[PDB]
């Protein structure tokens, strides 16, 4: 299923599309107690490294909080930020940047 949620510039807001994506994972995690996921937050290159580390954290926490409020056991979740340092696309335009503003749902 969809293992990635994308974000707009300088935003950690979730959309209704994201709700559906995350709802599926929430249900799966609640039915599979031994499954664990790492929610990694990322940003595009605009702005400082530290600013983006924080933004990546806000994105990861938004996803983590959604799952927890949905009923997922906090012990099955881990939120970490990579800021702008682990891009999917190394490009220097919006086509590349939109791929980088994201939170990845990585199952162990």
- Resolution value (Å, 1 decimal): 1.5
Tracing tokens 């929610």 back to the chain, one arrives at: 39
Domain total for the chain?
1
User: Which domain range does residue 66 map to?
Assistant: 1-108
CATH number, domain of 91, equals 3.30.1330.60
SS (H, E, C) the chain: CCCEEECCCCCCCCCHHHHHHHHHHHHHHHHCCCCCEEEEEECCCCCCHHHHHHHHHHHHHHHHHHHHHCCCCHHHEEEEECCCCCCCCCCCCHHHHHHHCEEEEEEC
Q: What experiment produced this structure?
A: X-ray
């Amino acid at each position: 299923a969809k293992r990635v949620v994308h974000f707009d510039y300088d935003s950690s807001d979730l959309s209704t599309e994201d709700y559906q994506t995350l709802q599926a994972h929430a249900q799966f995690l609640m039915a599979n107690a031994n499954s664990k996921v790492a929610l990694t937050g990322h940003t595009d290159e605009r702005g400082t490294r530290e600013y983006n580390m924080a933004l990546g954290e806000r994105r990861a926490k938004a996803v983590q909080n959604y799952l927890i409020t949905s009923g997922v056991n906090p012990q099955q979740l881990e939120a970490v930020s990579y800021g702008k340092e682990a891009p999917v696309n190394p490009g220097h335009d919006e086509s590349a940047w939109k791929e980088n503003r994201r939170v990845e749902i990585n199952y162990e």
